[PDB]
Amino acid sequence: RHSRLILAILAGLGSLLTAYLTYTKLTEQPAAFATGDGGCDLVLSSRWAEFLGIPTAAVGLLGFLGVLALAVLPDPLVKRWRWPALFGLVSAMTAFEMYMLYLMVAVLRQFCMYCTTAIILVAGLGLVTVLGHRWLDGGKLAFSYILVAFLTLVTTIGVYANQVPPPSPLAVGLAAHLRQIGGTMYGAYWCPHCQDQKELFGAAFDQVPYVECSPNGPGTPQAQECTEAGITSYPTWIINGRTYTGVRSLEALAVASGYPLEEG
Incomplete structure (x- = not known):
């Protein structure tokens, strides 16, 4: 025993x-x-x-x-x-x-x-x-x-x-700009890549317009709102009518969003 x-x-x-x-x-x-x-x-x-x-x-x-x-x-x-x-x-x-x-x-x-x-x-x-x-x-x-x-x-x-680390410093500036412009990110919660895209913003992402794409997880058909705007893979950004695929840098998103990056 x-x-x-x-x-x-x-x-x-x-x-x-x-x-x-x-x-x-x-x-x-x-x-x-x-x-x-x-x-x-x-x-x-x-x-x-x-x-x-x-x-x-x-x-x-x-x-x-x-x-x-x-x-x-x-x-x-x-x-x-x-x-x-x-x-x-x-x-x-x-x-x-x-x-x-x-x-x-x-x-x-x-x-x-x-x-x-x-x-x-x-x-x-x-x-x-x-x-x-x-x-x-x-x-x-x-x-x-x-x-x-x-x-x-x-x-x-x-x-x-x-x-x-802290959402610094444009991480917050951009998240507020995206919130105002209504540029939206479509992604799963189970998506590693989307988690990565969420990572770049840090705690700032809470401002970002996000559309949860599969509320019932994997193997189950995606939410209508995502199928309407015509999403296939995650993450997808539709910012200013233009659609962008996968993960993109805060700099790349700034360009797509019209955010003025200043270095002088």
């Missing part, structure tokens, strides 16, 4: 998923499955999927390679520190993953199988670590978690708040 073999076995698998989720991003190859419009295509290609410059998969590698090491190292300065070390580490791993899951539930509204697996794997770990050895302290486990979780979440968010 008590075992740390379920640890090394899950931690091994965890290591492999993470390993070639990293190898994928790190070589920019597509994920073995997906590319079916949004999904792992959006998720993996979105920001967040990188953490402090490296792949977030690569972060999860350190996690899954940590938990494996502890589980596989024989009882050594670890005998005393194994089952607390394992706990703190896995606590962190569950916390991170709940925020990742949150990202998918809200503020991506999209899911990834490779990412879901990760979660379930860590959920297997979380069960095992709690039930695979008891201190029967109760109060400390409940505390220790709430600490580590709070420490993970604070750092995690504080890294992802570092991820998006």
